[PDB]
Point group: D2
Chain length 331, copies 4
């Protein structure tokens, strides 16, 4: 399977890393970004959050060399990308700028067979969450979205609850790590004023569509969930706090058993169940979409619960991108 | 009224700061801590969070000298050895964080204090008060009282406004809370909450809180109707309450905003504040309100299920409430 | 004096703040930035580091409105379309961090009387530091530089040392607060790879010209100083660590006395002298260029010393910008 | 060799981690600390800085059980520690409380053969730095010190410089990660007022004796070095900034070549040499004592240089403790 990575940021680089951390047919043929390949190679090899990687990797003549040679490109506009000539099966669209189906289809015009957007999409782009609705994928879907890190944490938990107890209504908060859209010192962020305030000085409220996005993958939950976020000063790992009213009376123990059973069966490699006294740093490098924290949750009564689920918003999501690439593509 | 401050920490020092900032008639006779007065004076004058204060203050002859105020320093870890009889102490501000059971705190009364105000939730038959919510329930017979927690002081005024206007069926609260002195700079042991010892500025840290049940203490109509939890995160001050509430009456988000705004203009004056600005935690450093409703941050699922957001400076807002409660006790005992 | 502010970032906003905190005869007539005025007004009023300011300020009628002060917001990217002629602009405060004298002269082409660059300049730009060489300013200098925060901290101390003891050689480190050029998580920084690594996860080495730049305002020190920086996870306040070999034998105590006397006299309101157990947060809002930390320094012998001087790299520098503006207004 | 760990903090736990990581013949027979063993086991298995370790490890019957390793947990006053019953060859003294020789000798009174203090000591305690002077260890040395993290970073660099060029004088700064002596919010620290100010809000000046301890390990350098520290808001990894006046003229490149050569030969596994654009987080888990940062340093002239060397003050130091224990095991 021949892929390119457009946008070599946190997600693009860690997608490459996670590809290298498994046995996979994926062939990464090119990387496109706005800076030179020697700097991109440096950022791939040295990671403040996830530590060093690929010590033998080198840059030479615009190629990332690992044994594997990946072309580096630095071409601002899609019409100029050589996807036909590179025989590209999938573009990993990870710049964070192209979420419109019109902007992203220009990857297909320049010769790519499929595009995977590493973010919520604008418009009705088919959106998949592994372990929740990925079996709805149709080969005719030439532009697809892997949703957000937060939706990938919430949707599996919501599915377990829907399948065992029913959901009447839910309101989610994610206490979320700082991300590249934020600023080191107070600065302007036109489309999110709060998001420009100093990222490590502040708890910063943010809007999020991740809870509503669960209705895209679990149609029964459309209109039944919404939420918000607080951005906080950690560099990685986030947590979903789901306040949910269930459709039937249950106990906290029954919820734990339902989640533990799903993690052992239908949610294997997607959800994990823990009773340990965990904190955010314990999930750095965690590849699960959703880690249910049994000790942290609380029950008000037999229908009203507050549940806690962790996610490495960088590595868990990058791993899911790779899982979706392997699932959708042929050969 | 003659008070002493036992434990000259974040809360003890900022209680003194707020006493001085309103030129209060309270007499701070003595300060007790585990270290000498020169170091304590240094900490009172220089504050990483709230800036320098009282530049003319000096440590002199074992006292803190600030104008006409001269406060004796003590360094006696044992409550049974404190000279409260000899100092004619009306109220001990108990802010060490070590004495939480009512019988531990009563030791101050054995050593000669007339009354104790614990700057924290207490266990046992301790009345717990929140200014603007139930403080007029104070009785001169209450010789040991609690000002609850910072979080309870943020949630209870909001909970009262909702109860009075719409009714509350059930509520589940989270507080995203600043790191505090119970935490550690690097991974270390915390006997009562293992997670709480993990490096404070490396982690989002789940924690238990009793603030939701305590609202049921201040507002008996809400007994059994609220619970919640906390996440400690890497900021040095200011915290936020995230209240997911099912109301008894159908309403709109805008009507909730108007109810809070009206309360902040009337029955909750100086306790709750209402904003529509694009605020972040640092905007509340030095904020003296108990609860600042963040109108733009909240979300509505439907006409009865809402997520409401309220900020609090867990240091300065709470310290200001301590001074408010002290002056109230002074006027009603 | 009629000024405009080009670039409303940390420096631009805090220069406006300091002008207003000292209710100065400088008249601020316009702000140019490529962000809308409602957001810029928000950032001016709410500051994570320095607290809220000007609560009565509003964005209204395309202006920043504060009492009788009304400031036009502009969003003009080409320096020739700037209406400095019609606005009768005496000084452009150039604080974008993007503008090499050839580019900056175009402000005068569009009608401004003089330009003040809030950073080190390349080319034939006079460089001034208040309290060290700001009297070299000549009305014929239509483009001038206020140097860097770090140069404004090091040069006053260096002048006191040169005048009392002489300097043979010095090597400086500044342990510097994070700045807007840095990144929240690992990202690319073309001319400074380390500078793109997560700002609050790392101690980050950086190059600095501040020490060599001290030779501009103190020619006696040309070739005698260099240095480097470590960027660390604080949002503001930085500290100079100067290892210096002096030209005569002295004691640490005598160095403290030279600095204290200068802070009481020729360096008044420029340098400050403390013996308190200070830490960086104690200088948030500090307006001095350089605060000598008497307790922190060490002496190896009678000629070789390590001296420590603090500076609020935001507020101290902004205050020096305002001071230089007022000096330029009184002698122009 | 049978050892116990007194004080199961950052150093104590990571010493145990490094023993297990290299499947070492050292036998850890007991751990003493002031908290229960299930909490200590949790802290050993989950580490915010260095990640999880020993997933199969468990607390059982008052012991830490890891395979065949069964480590007694104690929670005890040095007077009643059961070193006689445990047949203890070495106490790893890692509490940070016992630094003077007579306090530490109470370990020998309670039955231990030898004590290794994981800190600079007070009194006639021989101090060793692996790769610098550890072969001076004598079996008669029943109380020894491994110096500090900082000394283990500075001394190898200083030895390379001394052997190749000579050192006339040096002033060192370490920009140091926050440690367990510091506080989350402003609190009292009797022996260091600045050290109690909020650790992640501040750059915090601190005293250090590491430069003078290098004179202990390299007597040729006694009196020629001193220095200071800044504590800054990172949870691990520190850097030495050494301003040095060498006795012979050289070039920066020749310094780089001398260090690179030492790292390949006499300092193998002690010093590392890099030319990469590194930042502090790149050294989390680094086991070397001193990592020379070739790109970061600067030269004023052919005798006066600023050299930069990194160290994981937790893991590098812990690894050196294990190295010294194995050396003592082979020479006692
Ligand atoms: N970081 C997370 O936790 C996370 C989680 C889930 C989803 N995502 C999504 O992944 C996407 C990328 O996020 P990120 O965290 O990697 O951000 P990032 O800023 O780290 O990465 C973006 C990269 O793309 C490059 N780029 C920008 N414009 C470009 C262009 N025109 N052409 C090519 N390259 C360009 C940037 O220089 C940068 O290297 C976003 O859409 C984000 O919403 C991120
Ligand atoms: N920080 C907040 O946000 C906050 C808010 C509300 C309530 N409180 C509560 O107030 C109390 C104090 O909290 P803090 O944050 O100020 O803690 P702190 O650690 O800052 O202050 C405690 C002080 O007590 C001193 N002390 C300890 N043992 C002592 C003893 N035996 N005798 C005398 N002094 C002693 C310590 O040296 C320290 O100065 C706790 O009960 C805490 O729960 C704190
Ligand atoms: N952290 C570093 O970077 C570093 C580096 C080199 C050397 N050191 C030195 O190593 C020593 C330990 O430092 P640390 O960082 O591990 O500190 P720490 O605080 O993390 O560890 C000390 C441990 O000892 C325990 N303890 C306290 N009093 C005790 C007693 N009387 N009996 C038994 N156990 C007791 C504490 O509960 C704690 O777990 C200190 O001398 C320190 O200077 C630290």
């Amino acid at each position: 399977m021949r892929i390119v990575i457009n946008g070599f940021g946190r997600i693009g680089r860690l997608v490459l890393r996670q590809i290298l951390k498994r046995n996979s047919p994926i062939e990464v043929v090119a990387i496109n970004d706005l800076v030179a390949g020697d700097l991109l190679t440096y950022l791939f090899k040295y990671d403040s959050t996830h530590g060093s990687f690929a010590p033998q990797a080198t840059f030479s003549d615009g190629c990332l060399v690992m044994g594997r040679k990946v072309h580096f490109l630095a071409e601002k506009d899609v019409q100029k990308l050589p996807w036909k000539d590179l025989d590209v099966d999938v573009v990993v669209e990870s710049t964070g700028l192209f979420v419109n189906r019109d902007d992203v289809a220009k990857h297909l015009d320049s010769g790519a067979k499929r595009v995977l957007i590493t973010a919520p999409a604008k418009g009705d782009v088919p959106t998949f969450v592994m372990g929740v609705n990925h079996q709805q994928f149709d080969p005719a879907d030439v532009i697809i979205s892997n949703a957000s890190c937060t939706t990938n944490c919430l949707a599996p938990l919501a599915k377990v609850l829907l399948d065992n107890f029913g959901i009447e209504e839910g309101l989610m908060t994610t206490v979320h790590a700082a991300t590249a859209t934020q600023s080191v010192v107070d600065g302007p962020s036109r489309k999110d004023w709060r998001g420009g305030r100093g990222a490590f000085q502040n708890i910063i409220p943010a809007s999020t569509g991740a809870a509503k996005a669960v209705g895209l993958c679990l149609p029964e939950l459309k209109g039944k969930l919404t939420g918000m976020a607080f951005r906080v000063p950690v560099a990685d790992v986030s947590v979903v706090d789901l306040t949910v009213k269930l459709s039937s009376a249950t106990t906290y123990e029954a919820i734990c058993e339902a989640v533990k059973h799903a993690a052992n069966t239908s949610m294997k490699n997607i959800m994990y169940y823990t009773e340990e006294a965990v904190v955010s740093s314990d999930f750095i490098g965690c590849e699960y979409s959703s880690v249910f924290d049994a000790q942290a949750g609380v029950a008000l009564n037999d229908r009203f619960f507050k549940l806690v689920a962790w996610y490495d918003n960088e590595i868990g999501y990058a791993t899911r991108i790779v899982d979706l690439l392997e699932y959708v593509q042929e050969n």
